[PDB]
Structures are given as C-alpha cells and as structure tokens.
Design a protein around this ligand. Structure first.
Ligand SMILES: [Mn+2]
Ligand SMILES: [Mn+2]
Ligand SMILES: [Mn+2]
Ligand SMILES: [Mn+2]
Lengths: 613, 613
C-alpha cells in the first residue's frame, strides 16, 4: 500500500549499544520511503538515552516505543551464555511474549547492522513466505558450525553452515498461533543437558529450532547480511557495489579487521557514521504554532527563532559509571565547549577528581573525531565519571544556554558548579568543596558559593599550591583579576582587598553587571533561551539566583586561574556588530520587565540601577 | 537501456560559477545509477579550475569533456544581452555547432539547478516524444512574458506564460537536420530591429524559436522546473514532497527568496551541498597498481598508502584577480592553514599588500561556513589578490606537504615566500622583498633569501616599526628565537647575534636540523611527500634545496614574529605511539638513501652528520 508502517525490533544493552543504534537507525532512515515504527528493548540507561535522543530528533513518520528489559530479564535467566554482548543476546527470542499481540511482523536487527538500501525491499520479502515458513533467516557465511576451523571444536547442531541471527524476519501472528513459546523452551533445555553453555547466545538456540523443524526457515539470499569475520567468504556472495544491501560487522576487532576490499566497506561505514543527521529530520503542532506568529522584521528576531529550537541531544556519548557516596554532598562541574577548547579537558581532568558534566557541542564528524580522541588518551579513558552530552550543530547562532541547561538537568549528584571549560581550579578542590558544603550546611538553607576569578599570561607557570603563595605572587603580581582591563565590574565587586585577610567566607550584595561563577543546588533555575552566543549571558542566571533570595557566599580558600586562550568568533562578532548590541539591550528590557511581572516589586531595583547609571 | 549512458551539458563562466557547478554535479551524482558524461562549455578560468577538480575527484563512471568558449564567443556577440549571467547565457543556443554530430541528445542544465532525484528518470522522457518534437521545456512559473506584471512591460513574444530554459532536453540529431542555425539567426535578426536588446538572454530567444514554430516543443511536467522567485504560483505546480524532482533559484537574491514552504526548499538545498563529496567515489589504474603492492604488514603501510593519495582540490574557491606588473619580480606568500587556526587569517592580510596563496583544509559542510565568513569580513572582500585553494578532508594524517604543493604550482608571479599562517611579517615586507629581489639580482642565479624567525609569549603586544625597536623588545626579554626551548636547532644556525649588527645580507652554510624560511624562485623542488603530518615537514625540503647547489642569503632588514597559538591533535599523535616514530625513522633512512642515489657523493655529508650524532 506504499505505507505499511514497517516495524523493527532492536536489542540495546550498555552505552556502546545505546550509541550504535544511532548509526543503525541512520542507515535505515537514509533510504527510507515509507513510515517506520521501531521497538527498542532497553535497560534503564539505554531507555533514558534513546528516549531523549528520539524525542529530540523530531523525525517525521517515525515512532519509537521503548520496552523494559528489567521485568523480562528473568525469562532467559536460566540459559547460560558466553557471548560478549551478554544475556541480552538471548532475549531476541522472547519478543513474541514481549511485543503486543496486535502486531504481525518485525525485522529483528542487532545493533551493529548497517543498511545500504531501503528496508522497504527487505520488508517485501514478507510476500514470499509459503507453507509453514514462519521465521526468516540467512545462511551463516562462516565455518563456525562446520566444526573444522580448528581441532577440538564441538558446535551446537545446525543445518549445514548454520545461520547468523543478525537479521530475522518474523511472522508474529503465526508464531503466536502455533504455540511458539513452549517448543523453543523445550528445545532450549533439551540441548543444554550434555554440554555446559551456548557459544553464540540467541544465535545458538534459534539454530536448534531451525534444525529440529526445517519447515519454518526461509533461506534468504546470501547478500542480505554479508557477515565479515576473520575467516569470511563473502567474496562469492557479492560481485559489485550495487548487489550489496546490508552488512554485519561481527568481529571483536570491529573496524580493525582485514579483507580484500575492507577499504570500500569501511568507506561506506564512515559515509553514514558521519552523515549529518540534522539533515535527515524531514510537540510538533505546538512548536509550529509558536513558529506561526514569529515575525521576520525584528532587529534580532533570530534570537526568538532560536530560543525554542530543538537540537539533537545524544546524552552520555561515552561510557559513564558512578557510585554515589553516603555523605550526599558531591559537586559536579558543567561547561560548554567546542573544538577550539578541547585541549583544556586533560588539564581539567588533571584538576578535578569527582564527576563532571560537559555540554560538548560538535557536528557529527567532529563528534567521531572526539570519539577517537577520547578512546586515545589514557587520562580520559581511566576517568569513568566524566559525562559527554553531545548537542549536534544546527542554525547559525551559538545556543550556549541550551548546552549549559542540557548539562544541568542530567547530573548524578545533588549540588553542582557552574563555570566554563577555560577556568582551571585548584588541586584538591573536590575535597575542599566537600568539606565546605558539609560545614556551611546548605542542605537546609538557600545559599550560593562563588569561586573568585583571575587571569594570567604565563603559559608555563608553575601551578600555585597555597593561599600564602598566591599572596606572594600577587605582591609580585604576575596575574591579575579576571578582565581587569575590559570589565572591572565583572569581579571587582568581590572586593578582593578584604579577601586577603579573610579566613572564612563572606557575604556580598548584588552590583551592576555582577557575573560570578557559582556553586548551587540543583534546583537553581535554568537559563533564559532568549540569549544565544556571547554577552550578558551568565548575569541573567545570577539575577534569578539573587531575586530568589539566595545569599552569595564567596569561598575564602579557593580561586581559579584562567589559562590563556585564543580569541573566538562570538566575541569578535559581538564587538563588531552594533545591531547585536542594541537587540541585546532590548532583550535586557524585556527580561527585566518579565522578571518584575513574575516577582513584582523586588525586581525593580535593577531597573532603578539602570535609571541611576 | 540498463545504464546505456547519461549525457549532460553545463555552461560555466566567471569565478562565481565554479562553486555552483560543483554543487549541481554532486546533487546529480547523489542519485545516480548509470554512467555520466559531462560537457562543460567553459572559459579559460573555469576550464583551469574544473579540469583539476574533476581530475582529482576520481569519480567512477564519469567522463568530463571541456569545450572552449573563447574561440566561439563571437557567434552570439552580435546579439545584445542584459541578463546578469552575461553573454555566456546565449552559449546554450549553439551547442550543436560545438558538440560533434557523434551525439544526438543531451540535457542542458544551468549551473544553479539541484536535482532532488536520479537524472535517469529525467532522461526517461526521451522516449515519450512524438513525431518532430525535438526540444523539451517547462512552463514559466512567473508572469514576465504575459506583459501584465507591471505597467509598460514589453517582453519578447512567446506562447502563453512562456517557457524557462532552466532544464533543456534536446534531440540534437533532428535539431541539426532542420537547419536550426539559419532559422534562429533569422529569428533573432528580425527580433532585434525594433526593440533595444534581449531581457532574459537565451531564455528570451528560445521562446521566440518556440513561438515561430509552436509544434517543436514538448511541455514537460510542471514539477520539473520549480522556479522560485517573487511572482511564483508553484504551489499549484507542486503538491507534496514526491511532487518535487528538480529545483531552480531564479532571482539575484538566490538564498534570500521567500515562499510558503521555503523551509523544505532550503533543506533540499543544504542536503546535497553539505554532503562530504569524498564519499561519492563508488590516470587511475596507475594509482590502483601502486596501491596494490603496499604491504599491510609493513610498519609504514598507512603512510605509504597516504602519500600516493589524491585529494579533492578546488582551486580558487573565491574570486581572484591580478594585474601583472612589468617588474617581473612580485612575490607571493604560501601557507597551510586549517579551521582550528583560521582565526588569524585577517592577521596575515593586514600584513600583506601583495598577492598571497593559501591552502586551506576544510570540510565541505564547514567549507560553506568558511564561504560565509569570507563573504562577511570586509578585510578579505577589499582584497582581490588572495587565492583560496581548498583540499577537502580525507584520511587521518595531515598531508601538509600536499597543501604546500597545491599552493606552489598555482602562483601568478615568478617568485614566492614559504612560511606558515601561524606566523606574521613586518609592515611593508612586500616592498622590502621587492627591493631585495631587484637588488640581489636572483633573475639568473639559484639563490634563496631567509627571513629570521622569533616568537613571543604574550597575546597582546604592539607591532614594532624598525629593527632597533625590535631588538629593544627582544632584549627586554619579551621575545625569543622561534623554538628556543624545545627545538633549538631549528633556527639557531642563524646565530642572531651576528645579524643584530648586520647591515648587508650575509651567506650561511647548512647545519644540523636547520629549517629556515625561504624566499625562492618557483622552480625549487616540490616538498617530499614521504613525510606526512607534523614534525620534520620542512628541513627535508631544505636539505633537498641545498644539495642542489642553492646558496643561502639571510636578509638583514626583515623579520617576522610568531603569535602564540594553542596546540592541535597532530602534535598529540606525534607524541602518542612509538610506531609512528619508527615509521618516521624508516622514511628517514629511505630519504637519505634515495637522495644520495639521485645525487650521490654530495649526500654523504648529511649521512656523516647522522653518523656522528
Ligand atoms: Mn553480531
Ligand atoms: Mn576567554
Ligand atoms: Mn536561472
Ligand atoms: Mn606554533
């Protein structure tokens, strides 16, 4: 009917799979022509990642339904397995019970597949099933089951070379009809009485129920999944580029394998592993209705256009693991960055010790480059507790607030710290703020902690170690208060003069254009989307913290030393475009009046200050 | 007939059209199934750009043939024109005179089209013509020809709304048998006596050729040429997404046109242009049979493969121009730059008055980012004499020598200066180099000039004026010799102590690891490709240029000072693994041996040095 709403099922388990299903879905969608409907069996972490990802793509004619695996985990718990994927591999057979009875046919695909062609043609194979051919599989393209690869090998019984369950084409309705659960269960225990465990997890069990009843299978043509292993024989299963339709990269080495034409296959792989998904995307009604009233005649309307724009967010790109402590007083950094500021990560990785978040902002190709880089550095790899929240590129402006609030919402500790990637904290600051949070006891009251700012110009500076050493180095003064020659009010209002002699934190009121760096509990407000780029950005958040009656505490025994960095493009554009400035000022008026409306008299002070200045 | 052949013809003229032709070509190829054969009616400049572009793509099943336009410019010169394209617009009318009778039918697309579907489908309409209908066309979507858009409008006579020449589908074989040449010439002569000149150039005349014989034309489907302008009713001519196959941009605004659903058109415009064209590759056999015997087990397999590679080069990305001078001594810088370091491009431009030829290294998607940036900054626009040679990304290493060579060969003056964009010359270095070239009289001999290298470690410094002031800052301790803390041997042989008191140029011999910056004639040897990446990318060229009996001169009254910069991944990979260092060393002995072999005893000198060290 040209629109049958093709149905798919994918097993996701672990962060690696969570991030490989992205590539598989890219491959399927690239050649799509009719509506799709996925069905991802996911654990909690994969559930969150993929929920956010798909809810952010805004794909058309595509739907996503997530099925819990924790409840269905026990079903196969009695089947020992040895596959590197884990116990989640076997579960690809319980789909009949898990999926709804109202569905008929699903292309069960493993994560690593990649389709070079539309899945419509593969779906078409559902018009060639005859007799009691209810499953759909392909002949194995290896010698694993033949029992001749090496001496003393005892593969589980199978028909000829065996089959690889990379792609399965099912008739759910039928399997439900003829009592599918019990016979495969019976075969399962029947084939486990003699030996220890399976060798390929689900792939093994299916082969059993393939061998015992050979009238269910349907020997699809070999070129539906060109299995590539260390002993591949796909050369006879393809002749040219056009014939290939689908690939399976079954190897622990993955991309390090060697073949006669591995170059072309790898090039194709990178074609879609690097394709700009933000282009494939062609909640919706409200979004479009907001887009309706939008006017193109405003000075900086584009700020309004970008205020509510939705960007593809792929949360937790790389592995992440964290065990919360009993104290319940942890802190985690957050920061935006792009290419120009990557190098600082190592430095920050050499500074922090606890978890940090990061709203890393790159295109797809730069995202893969970062993947390689983070897979290279030993310091990054050894650090488990560093999240990597990716927000892909789109539009022209820089949605910095979007990046920082995306990093805000997803944190695994109660309190948090706001900064930028440039700043480099102390050594041991993690324990310092641990003790400080414990002592000031913010678990009850409402307070903010500020770490003062600075800036130096000695690239090869020895890392200071003690407050008294900073006193000596300021008496000599090699580095100065951050932005001491452009924006004195940025951090001068901290009144550094009294900082020196202090031994305990001191409170400070608000001042014109006061934009410190704060530590605060998670409840602190998100940023205002109206402002994208550089300029008058943090001070909005500061205004909200202040107007919520947050007392500003400045920590005595900490500080930050800006590591010099090259100028970026946002600052140059801000300093060059006057229209940017005037529309920023009108946005200032708008924000101030909205603040007044939402709180009332208390917010008038800012206005009065603007009237006084 | 199952990939019989697809033929196409494109008119190219002026620098502003090469980019358009490349985007159109990638758009067409994105949906290809059959082999393709392009005929580019091109001028000298377009010929020069596109020859190398297509010779470097290495696309399969594609043949490119260039037809000169300078010889055939006069054929239509007698026909006045007012279209923004110019005289070349009429060139679409005399293809039969150009294209040999060996061909019978060929599409003709203006450079701005962007097919959204396979061109084979369009080619299919060459079996649906009846009798004598040779020329195929589509209806104009405007009301220009109807003479009702505005008062006092007198467009050339036409049938109905008129037809647009955006896409032409010819049947040349009949069009020659009809004596088309005399017919259109007479029609034009008749239609030029009364009015002043043509309005739409070729589209203004073809329509008349239709009217005077209404039964030639084939009225194609309207949804082929969806012209987008200020007076379009295409919403009637297009219904859905599947109702779109080929788009045109018929307004000087181009990117700044407005429509009801323009969002999808903009998406369809960025969908192909954004594509990384290096993934479309699915003089050649030589490359294959060198790649054949690259031992995978060899420690330099990746290096060996990389060196022979060919990269997509798009010479003269932006407008270029140069008025030759009678001095015949002009110099032109060269540099290798990437986007992680693009920021200081203006920096070099403020310090150069004469022509300079860069060599960027960009990603297509972000190549357009660079296009926008260059079109924004007024400093670059003010200067017409700057080249921009983009060699797109490919692979993992950094073929810097490729960038340098691409900038070497294509230079409009006989003399050149080699440096890096990460450096910076004095004010007036161009004039001083001119004087030195005309004075030392290098017009005959094989000598080179060297400009000394320093470095600074503070972002914000004033720009010196004279040599005395330079040495003043130097002795203040704010400046040092370039690489005076890691690689001292790079520039030490210049023994700046001697230069300080210098008043006339002085010669020097070679020293260990001596890597100056040279000003040289254009015959100096190409950079050795065997070394790729960062590190020992230049001293090899120096030892190549020294063994060849080139004397060295160090200019007394010139300098050039380094501006601090952050690191990149190339240095990280240079310090990452020992295998890279081992392969580097292997390439080292190979270079020594081969340079000896080609020159012999003279080489032993360098060898002896490495024996001593
Ligand atoms: Mn597998
Ligand atoms: Mn900064
Ligand atoms: Mn046009
Ligand atoms: Mn450098």
């Amino acid at each position: 009917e040209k629109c049958e709403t093709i149905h798919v099922a994918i097993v996701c388990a672990g962060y690696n799979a969570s991030r490989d299903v992205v590539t598989l879905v890219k491959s399927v969608l690239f050649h799509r022509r009719n509506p799709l409907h996925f069905h991802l069996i996911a654990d909690s972490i994969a559930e969150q990642i993929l929920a956010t990802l798909f809810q952010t793509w805004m794909v058309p004619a595509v739907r996503v339904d997530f099925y819990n695996a924790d409840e269905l985990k026990s079903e196969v718990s009695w089947i020992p397995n040895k596959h590197y994927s884990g116990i989640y591999g076997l579960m690809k057979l319980v789909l009949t019970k898990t999926l709804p009875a109202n569905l008929e046919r699903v292309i069960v695909l493993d994560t690593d597949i990649t389709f070079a062609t539309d899945i419509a043609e593969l779906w078409a194979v559902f018009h060639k099933f005859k007799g009691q051919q209810v499953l759909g599989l392909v002949e194995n393209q290896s010698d694993w089951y033949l029992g001749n690869l090496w001496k003393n090998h005892r593969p589980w019984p199978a028909l000829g070379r065996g089959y690889n369950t990379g792609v399965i084409l099912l008739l759910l309705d039928k399997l439900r009809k003829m009592k599918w659960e019990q016979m495969w269960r019976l075969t399962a225990e029947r084939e486990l009485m003699g030996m220890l465990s399976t060798s390929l997890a689900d792939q093994d069990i299916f082969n059993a129920v393939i061998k015992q009843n050979p009238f269910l299978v349907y020997q699809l043509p070999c070129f539906w999944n060109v299995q590539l292993s260390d002993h591949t024989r796909s050369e006879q299963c393809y002749r040219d580029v056009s014939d290939l339709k689908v690939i399976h990269w079954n190897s622990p080495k993955k991309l390090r394998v060697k073949n006669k034409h591995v170059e072309f296959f790898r090039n194709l792989y990178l074609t879609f592993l690097e394709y700009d998904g933000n282009l494939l995307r062609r909640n919706s009604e409200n979004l479009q209705k907001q887009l309706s009233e939008l006017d193109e005649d405003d000075l900086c309307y584009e700020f309004r256009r970008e205020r509510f724009t939705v960007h593809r967010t792929h949360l937790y790109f790389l592995h992440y693991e964290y065990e919360p402590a009993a104290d319940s007083t942890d802190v985690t950094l957050v920061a935006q960055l792009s290419m120009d500021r990557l190098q600082m990560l190592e430095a920050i990785c050499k500074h922090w010790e606890g978890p940090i978040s990061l709203a890393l902002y790159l295109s797809d190709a730069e995202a893969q480059q970062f993947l390689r880089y983070a897979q290279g550095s030993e310091v990054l790899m050894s650090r488990h507790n560093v999240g990597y929240h990716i927000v892909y590129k789109e539009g022209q402006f820089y949605p910095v607030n979007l990046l920082r609030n995306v990093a805000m919402k997803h944190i695994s500790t109660p309190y948090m710290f706001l900064s930028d990637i440039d700043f480099l904290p102390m050594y041991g600051l993690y324990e310092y703020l641990r003790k400080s949070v414990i002592q000031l006891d913010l678990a009850n009251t409402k307070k903010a902690m500020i770490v003062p700012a600075f800036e130096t110009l000695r690239y090869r500076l020895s890392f200071p170690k003690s407050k008294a050493e900073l006193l000596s180095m300021l008496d000599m003064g090699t580095l100065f208060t951050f932005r001491y020659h452009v924006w004195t009010k940025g951090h001068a209002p901290t009144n550094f003069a009294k900082w020196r002699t202090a031994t305990t934190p001191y409170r400070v009121e608000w001042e014109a254009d006061f934009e410190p760096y704060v530590v605060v509990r998670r409840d602190c407000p998100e940023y205002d989307r109206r402002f994208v780029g550089f300029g008058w950005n943090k001070v909005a958040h500061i205004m909200e913290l202040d107007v919520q009656e947050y007392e500003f505490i400045v920590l005595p025994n900490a500080y930050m030393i800006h590591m010099p960095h090259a100028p970026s493009f946002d600052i140059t554009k801000f300093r060059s475009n006057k229209q940017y400035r005037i529309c920023l000022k009108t946005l200032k008026e708008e924000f101030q009046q909205d603040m007044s409306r939402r709180y009332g008299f208390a917010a008038l002070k800012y206005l009065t200050a603007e009237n006084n200045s």
